[PDB]
Design a protein around this nucleic acid. Structure first.
Ligand SMILES: [Zn+2]
Length: 775
DNA sequence: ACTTACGGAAGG
DNA sequence: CCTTCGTAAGT
């Protein structure tokens, strides 16, 4: 099943994958134009050994280590100092090879940076050809573009035969501190006005990070944010005066403090606010997520223990909109919607989250398996769902537009696309009607648990990414989103990941990347996922959502080149606004069931108590999918003998032989856990029970008692967790529906995206959309 | 269709 | 030196 790909991606990923077809004296020139702030005259051009150096060109310096290549600088302005010496200001131009792109970068592509210099003009080694590339955006230009590119490529080859100096070009700005490539601000460069934006922004940043006190002792400035009296702020828990699998019990949240006065450098005095779970876990189990308590305690702190501000209101003036997850810092005490195409929709968690944000409506969806398509149809009545492999869908779509000579495919795709009836062909989308493309490719190949990843079946699953990219190349939408596992960026020395970025950079997109953890977004499951945002040159790239729940996880950083790392979001182990979610906050309300129940439709027996339960139930009155798969007698006995204590696992099984009712005697120990307990840490978690105060493990497609993840027993009942419990752990609402048998429903749950995460991403995308300036 | 037997690399 | 987070071979 070779992926069907366009020409651009196929050429980019060559020599890789399969299904690839190779078919002395310096003088001033001109007149003066003005003077700088200090009064020195500033010029535009200059003759250096018969070569003109005008504003907007490239100058090559000389550097040590003569084996290395010289640096390149983009000229901003030139002026003559009072000491009759020639001067020039330059901006560093980073080469492609010295970036995160690595070996996938092109030879002639340079990237603007925010680091500048001013060295004497005589010391420059020479001048180099340089130009700025800017092209119109839209699908109708695509053909023209490729022709132009072809011409360019040919010319370059000829030069490499005749060894003329190479020609360089630049299209974007590279920010490692932001971890992405952004559009060029074409109006603020090449101005030759004696004013540099990079130097100004660097000076403004350097001015920050220094404590400054305002007049009349009204307040102070820290890290760029102001703090004043009669406000509310955060204080770290350790500043103010053992685990098995759910290593999050011993963690605390930000302490809310109210500034009273500033006392003598200076020190602050803060009134403390207490929280329900500082009293007991039982009291916090039945308390609101954003409720605090009033105390008279005042404490003196240094001014360096601040991390933000917040608001405290009363129980009559609230936002009145109960969004989930919460993204605003408030506590208490007593016309732009986009047409969207979904690929690998699955059940539709990501689509549900992005539609709930009001930013996207899903007009077309593509799915592989029948039960997932049925679930998507049941959850989104007004959408169009295609249950087919994506390759044949792409081939049919390109056939409709008369572009069968611009695609690479196998005969199987053509055969399957020729069998589509006319009703399905007339409802397919066309370029120009799609504005948002989203989806998540298969993640079995890049997973860490897959110890058979170097097989034929796994290679074809990793190729689907290519097909995904082809879609973005043919429709050219305004936005693009990609989601995958954490180990996707490190798989195969990070080569393929890099290649992906390169492909997007060839299309004229602005790309940014990050890694988020779902546990800090109101979800009681540990889940690390990598995301990629891509936007058109005229649009604005979205920011990353800010986590608000304390989870014990270190900073997740992506390794750039030259020994640098980028972290998309901060770690929340040392403090956060909201306390973490436990399993009793999630599944503590459902009525007790026995092993192997099969009754689909039931009724709730007790009213919801926890905040999470109230948020996840709503107005639903019909219980569904609260069923579990049965176990044989041996596993039932093993589960019966497991103690109901935190941290319990297979190490508590007594050594004895049991006689079954059939007539066979069996060893209690599976004999596979003691066989290989030295290498795999003793299999800590196998045949293990959940923790009332702990958290769920990572959701998988088959929660069976003997697996690499384990930890799938009920805290107090001798059974496996039900499908509805897994849905609640993953964040699905109780109104959602699933199709098929129990295995199909579990597989649907295990392949989805937490809806709160998609809602946060959609909120960020909407915020970016509202910021698009008029043409 | 259901149960049992298990490799290495990254980041801390 | 601990911790992380699906495929294939028998019944
Ligand atoms: Zn500068």
């Amino acid at each position: 099943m070779q992926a069907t790909t366009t020409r651009l991606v196929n050429r980019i990923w060559g020599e890789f994958y399969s299904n690839y077809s190779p078919e002395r004296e310096i003088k001033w020139d001109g007149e003066s134009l003005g003077k700088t702030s200090a009064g020195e005259p500033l010029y535009q051009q200059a003759l250096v050994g018969g070569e003109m150096v005008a504003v907007g060109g490239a100058v090559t310096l000389e550097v040590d280590d003569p084996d290395e290549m010289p640096a390149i600088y983009f000229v901003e302005y030139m002026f003559e100092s009072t000491d009759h010496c020639k001067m020039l200001h330059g901006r560093f131009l980073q080469r492609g090879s010295m970036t995160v792109l690595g070996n996938a970068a092109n030879e002639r592509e340079l990237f603007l940076t925010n680091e500048c210099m001013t060295t004497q003009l005589k010391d420059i080694k020479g001048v180099a050809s340089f130009e700025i590339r800017s092209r119109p955006w839209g699908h109708q230009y695509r053909k023209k573009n490729i022709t132009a590119d072809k011409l360019d490529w040919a010319r370059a080859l000829e030069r490499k035969v005749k060894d003329l100096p190479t020609e360089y070009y630049c299209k974007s700005l590279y920010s490692p501190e932001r971890g992405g490539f952004f559009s060029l601000p074409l109006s603020d460069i090449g101005r030759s006005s004696g004013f540099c934006t990079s130097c100004k922004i660097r000076e403004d940043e350097e001015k920050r990070s220094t404590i400054k006190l305002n007049v009349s002792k009204t307040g102070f400035f820290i890290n760029g944010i102001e703090y004043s009296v009669e406000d509310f702020v955060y204080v770290n828990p350790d500043s103010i005066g053992s685990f098995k699998s759910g290593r999050n019990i011993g963690l605390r949240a930000y302490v809310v403090c109210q500034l009273l006065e500033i006392v003598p450098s200076f020190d602050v005095k803060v009134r403390r606010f207490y929280r329900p779970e500082d009293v007991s876990a039982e009291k916090a189990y039945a308390s609101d997520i954003q409720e605090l308590y009033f105390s008279q305690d005042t404490v003196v702190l240094p001014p360096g223990a601040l991390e933000g501000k917040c608001e405290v209101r009363k129980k009559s003036d609230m936002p009145l909109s109960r969004e989930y997850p919460i993204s605003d810092h408030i506590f208490f005490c007593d016309e732009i919607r986009l047409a969207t195409l979904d690929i690998f929709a699955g059940c539709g968690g990501l689509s549900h989250g992005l539609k709930k944000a009001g930013v996207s409506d899903a007009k077309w969806a593509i799915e592989y398996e029948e039960p997932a398509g049925q679930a998507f149809k049941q959850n989104h009545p007004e959408s169009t769902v295609f249950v087919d492999n994506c390759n044949v869908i792409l081939r049919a779509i390109m056939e409709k537009g008369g572009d069968q000579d611009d695609c690479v495919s196998t005969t199987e795709a053509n055969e399957l696309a020729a069998k589509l009836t006319e009703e399905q062909k007339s409802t397919l989308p066309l370029p120009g009607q799609v504005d948002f493309i989203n989806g998540g490719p298969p993640c079995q190949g890049f997973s860490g648990m897959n110890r058979f990843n170097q097989s034929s079946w796994s290679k074809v699953q990793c190729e689907m990414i290519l097909a995904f990219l082809s879609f973005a190349d043919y429709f050219r939408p305004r936005y693009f989103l990609l989601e995958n596992v954490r180990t996707f960026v490190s798989f195969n020395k990070g080569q393929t990941f890099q290649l992906t970025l390169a492909s997007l950079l060839e299309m004229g997109y602005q790309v940014r990347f990050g890694i988020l953890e779902a546990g800090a977004y109101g979800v009681s499951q540990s889940r690390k996922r990598a995301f990629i945002w891509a936007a058109a040159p005229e649009e604005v790239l979205p920011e990353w959502p800010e986590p608000m729940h304390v989870f014990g996880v270190p900073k997740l950083k992506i390794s750039l080149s030259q020994g640098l790392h980028y972290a998309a979001v901060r770690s929340t182990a040392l403090g956060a606004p909201f306390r973490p979610i436990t399993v009793r906050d999630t599944i503590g309300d459902l009525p007790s069931v026995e092993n192997g129940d099969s009754r689909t439709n039931k009724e709730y027996k007790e009213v919801a108590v926890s905040w999470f339960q109230k948020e996840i139930r709503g107005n639903t009155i019909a219980l569904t999918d609260h069923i579990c798969k049965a176990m044989n007698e041996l596993n039932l006995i093993r589960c019966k003998l497991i103690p109901t204590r935190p941290g319990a696992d297979w190490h508590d099984l007594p050594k004895r032989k049991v006689t079954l009712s059939d007539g066979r005697v069996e060893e209690m120990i599976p004999f596979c856990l003691p066989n290989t307990a030295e290498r795999h840490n003793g299999w800590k978690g196998l045949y293990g029970r959940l923790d009332w105060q702990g958290n769920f493990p990572t959701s998988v497609t088959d929660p069976q008692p003997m697996g690499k993840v384990g930890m799938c027993f009920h805290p107090e009942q001798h059974r496996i967790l039900t499908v509805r419990e897994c849905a609640r752990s993953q964040g699905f609402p109780d109104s959602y529906e699933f199709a098929g048998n129990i295995n199909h429903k579990h597989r649907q749950i295990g392949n989805a995206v937490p809806p709160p995460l998609a809602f946060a991403l959609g909120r960020k995308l909407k915020e970016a959309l509202h910021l698009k300036k008029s043409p």
